[PDB]
Amino acid sequence: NVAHGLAWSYYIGYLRLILPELQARIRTYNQHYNNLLRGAVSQRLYILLPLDCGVPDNLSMADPNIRFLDKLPQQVYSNSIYELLENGQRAGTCVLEYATPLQTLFAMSQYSQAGFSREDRLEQAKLFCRTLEDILADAPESQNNCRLIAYQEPDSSFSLSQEVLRHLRQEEK
Amino acid sequence: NVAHGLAWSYYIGYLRLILPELQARIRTYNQHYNNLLRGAVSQRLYILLPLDCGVPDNLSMADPNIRFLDKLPQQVYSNSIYELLENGQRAGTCVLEYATPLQTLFAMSQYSQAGFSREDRLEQAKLFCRTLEDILADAPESQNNCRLIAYQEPDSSFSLSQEVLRHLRQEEK
Predict the structure, then answer these.
(1) Residues of A within the annotated binding site?
(2) Domains in chain B, start-ordered, CATH in brackets?
(3) What is the effect of changing residue 5 to E (chains A, B)?
(4) Cα B33 from chain centre
């Protein structure tokens, strides 16, 4: 039942650290990194939670319509702005990253001495989102600075860019 | 019951990574970083587990008889060699560090929305060592490359250097 510790550490040792000074680093990119143009990166941190726990080290490997734009300026943690493409053109920009602890779950199910099957993994990943949802709920302001994008995959097709673009548009209003 | 996830992640995402190429990086420091002298740093990774979960960011703050000697050479993870002093003179050298996840436990008990008392912390820290002991047992070779130094503190006095120097000598034979 590793999910509990996974969620607490991820909030306590990461989110609660970067999330407070988050929107600031963004308006800095949007308004103080250029003279000629205002940037339009969303205000929130988008966290990918594939319940499959696959974490490609390049999001273009997950979707060529997700392209790295720039590093979120600092103030040390490194974050990444991405543009999302739709029909060959930019539909949004946000800071985007995987929830790193899913790597632990993935790796746990590739390691014999753990007795960890794909079904264990899934059961644990879902548990992880729910625990994290709950922590962020009872955590002041934090829940508002970020949005959780949990998803699985069928056997049709799946667009990660469309998935993000949803919240990226559903938040414009 | 965060300890389980804490232990698995610490093994899966850290120990199982650095421990394999560990003794190599040490003999490199001991035999290939100098021409005139052979180094005498121990072969194992010494992991501090204060059940109090206090982690000072300088081990000289924990014990002035523990002094930073050098960074363990690489091959990216950074590690630290320490000399241990006894009566003003060097009694051993080893690579030494805290088990980082105890920070999560410490911080959890300083954060209201968690319902985490000192007693919760202790109960959880001990749980963490035991889980980690068990993982390292059923993990080939790994258990041999490292030694776990769990300890609490009274209300007499406690020497961290003496504690380490124990294993540092109990391993010489």
Answers:
(1) 9, 14, 76-78, 100
(2) 1-41 (1.20.5.5200), 42-173 (3.40.50.12100)
(3) Abolished homodimerization and activation
(4) 24
